[PDB]
């Protein structure tokens, strides 16, 4: 199976546009910080998040990522792998190529992918397509630097669903 292109790809996708690909040495590689399997075609879903958010990739979790970006069902039957990538995704001055969704009208259903860039409405006046008072652009960019702490450093996450 083409796992090399899944795990060793040069560029990873943002969590709001998380990538999906259709499909013992991985377990014994010992290069992964998180390897958790629930319940035991294959789907490999790849994205990049913060370290403190890795706890949100699990069935029955709440937060920004779990509710607005990536949701896992209660009866999940796959595995989650996550490893640190500070030496690749961080650069001096800041790497701002990764985005995530902050506001949404409703929670995401399991395995839902929202890429809309419509301006979120918080008040009553319509946004009319321009940012302003009580109207926010939904997607915000991460900031990764080589000096940040472990929880603020980038992490690459791959979810395998059978």
């Amino acid at each position, epitope marked *: 199976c083409p796992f090399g292109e899944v795990f060793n790809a040069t560029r990873f996708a943002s969590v709001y546009a998380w990538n999906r690909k259709r499909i013992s040495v991985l377990y014994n590689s010992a290069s992964f910080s998180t390897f958790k399997c629930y319940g035991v075609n294959v*789907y490999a879903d790849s994205f990049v998040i913060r370290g403190d958010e890795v706890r949100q990739i699990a069935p029955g979790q709440t937060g920004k990522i779990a509710d607005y970006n990536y949701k896992l069902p209660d009866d999940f039957t796959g595995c989650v792998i996550a490893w640190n990538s500070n030496n690749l995704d961080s650069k001096v001055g800041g790497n701002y190529n990764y985005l995530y969704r902050l506001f949404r009208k409703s929670n995401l*259903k399991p395995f839902e*992918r929202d*890429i*809309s*860039t*419509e301006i979120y409405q918080a008040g009553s006046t319509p946004c009319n397509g321009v940012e302003g008072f009580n109207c926010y652009f939904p997607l915000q960019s991460y900031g990764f630097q080589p000096t940040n702490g472990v929880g603020y450093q980038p992490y690459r996450v791959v979810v395998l669903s059978f």
Partner: antibody
Amino acid sequence: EVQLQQSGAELVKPGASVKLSCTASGFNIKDTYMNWVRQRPKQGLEWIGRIDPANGNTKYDPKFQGKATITADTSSNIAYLQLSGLTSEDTAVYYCARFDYDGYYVHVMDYWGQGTSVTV
Amino acid sequence: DIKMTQSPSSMYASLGERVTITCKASQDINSYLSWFQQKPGKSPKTLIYRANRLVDGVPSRFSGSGSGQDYSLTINSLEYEDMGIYYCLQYDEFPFTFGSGTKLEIK
């Protein structure tokens, strides 16, 4: 709302060329695929090809190889289809569509265009 | 190229009658099939994807089933707004292939 706007009708003499445009609003085309479909008068639907604007890779139906070329500009959020060597059998309405189940996702909706009439 | 077959080409049905359309492929496609409906003069719209999943907003009277090489679409209570041409598409292996189409009319 998500909209896909296509160019107007074009009259093409035989053997000439024409470039069609599909402008996308409401989303960034870099995050999805864009498909091209053709429907001849009183005929069925045929798939031409697709492009991934993130890297520019394209796929084609091999009977349309050498006749159509797909290009996308991420800065302007416009997808292009170039037709060359047109004959009288290429008179049809051309569609640009955005399916999301071709990326094998769940709880998705399709978005189509209005269609451009090309007469030869 | 995965040749795609549809049947019947045209049929008539009264209001409230149930209608089934057959969609058969030349080889296994792992249930990657989609259904389209096109009203006169309008652009096509996707009704069912993955052969049993409904697009949000579609009436619940629509249903789809099938596996392997045989797939089908069923309408329970046919109404006026169900006339048109119906297509089924495969997207498992390139190139994508449509069907010949089925025209539905009301007596």
